[PDB]
Amino acid sequence: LVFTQFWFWFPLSHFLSLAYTPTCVIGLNKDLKMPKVQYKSNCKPSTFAYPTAKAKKNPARVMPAQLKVLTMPETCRYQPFKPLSIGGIIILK
């Protein structure tokens, strides 16, 4: 809304900063325990590598369309509590 209003004022443009939520998928097992998970996208990076179906990574520049295709790596000891259908902050156990 403030951006739309920025046609009558320039300084207001900065307000778009509030409307910025990165698509990174955050994962953490414990209170601060960083996890060594690497979800297999099972798709061509192509979109990932914006300047062999697979992908690895902590959160990365993975998009909702690519998030829905990500594969949860059960091969590791700890697994997410809830599915990884879509990104966000999914904790692990």
């Binding site: 920025f6 046609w7 009558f8 004022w9 320039f10 300084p11």
Partner: protein, 274 residues
């Protein structure tokens, strides 16, 4: 210390006075001063305008008579609320709106007197309601030309200002100048009064004599019937022509409206009276 895309509000009384005064002395190149009012740097308004007396000098600075303006200001203070003289207007009948050396000298003098000293240019070039050749100009000093001309901080208003762009002669003399956005001051009571004026005065809406109407109607319909009968040939040929890789004539909305109104006149004829 920085210019912007400012605006000048002009009261309907103001523009009416300016145009009538200009048309009054078109050959003489009449001129005068306004009585404007300050609100902020972005916006300034004008409500009243008086005519400085005719002088053979022209638009010269000396044409301003201190005693005349002092007397007018005193009288206005006595009756109603006046305001400090924002600037000057004149009619440049030559072609559109522009300025000359004398004009810039006068503007510089006023700018020495006050802040804006906005200049107004009118011309006899007018339409019934579709010219408003009026325009507003303001000069730029040659000291800050290193600095930006008019620091802009709004896209919408700057683009609207550019939409008028600049006139041929304007570019011919656009320098030392920068036009300032004008707009008609909000108008409701005056607007409503005028709207009431049109119905009864500026066009036939007396509403009591509002309703030949049976004398010449026969003849008008005769003409149009004959004309449509003639025009019917062209669609005939058009249809006659094959695929081959002036039928549009309308002429029927006019008849529709005219004779339907005439028939409706029966409502007045048989009921409204007697």
């Amino acid at each position: 210390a920085v210019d912007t895309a400012e605006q000048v509000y002009i009261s309907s009384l103001a523009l009416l006075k300016m145009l009538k005064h200009g048309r009054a002395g078109v050959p003489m190149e009449v001129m005068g001063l306004m009585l404007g009012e300050f609100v902020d740097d972005y916006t300034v308004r004008v409500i009243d305008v008086f005519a400085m007396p005719q002088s053979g000098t022209g638009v010269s600075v000396e044409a301003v008579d201190p005693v005349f303006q002092a007397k007018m200001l005193d009288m206005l203070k006595q009756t109603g609320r006046p305001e400090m003289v924002v600037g000057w207007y004149h009619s440049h009948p030559g072609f559109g709106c522009w300025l000359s050396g004398v004009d810039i000298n006068t503007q510089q003098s006023f700018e020495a007197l006050s802040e804006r000293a906005v200049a107004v240019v009118v011309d006899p070039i007018q339409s019934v309601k579709g010219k408003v050749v009026i325009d507003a100009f303001r000069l730029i000093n040659a000291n800050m030309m290193v600095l930006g001309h008019e620091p802009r901080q709004t896209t919408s208003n700057l683009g609207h200002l550019n939409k008028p762009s600049i006139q041929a002669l304007i570019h011919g003399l656009n320098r030392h100048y920068y036009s300032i956005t004008i707009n008609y001051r909000k108008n409701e009571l005056e607007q409503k009064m005028l709207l009431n004026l049109h119905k009864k005065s500026w066009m036939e809406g007396l509403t009591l004599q509002d309703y030949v109407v049976k004398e010449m109607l026969e003849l008008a319909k005769n003409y149009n019937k004959a004309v449509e009968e003639e025009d019917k040939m062209t669609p005939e040929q058009l249809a006659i022509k094959n695929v081959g890789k002036r039928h549009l004539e309308e002429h029927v909305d006019v008849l529709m409206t005219s004779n339907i109104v005439q028939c409706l006149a029966a409502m007045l004829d048989t009921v409204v009276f007697k």
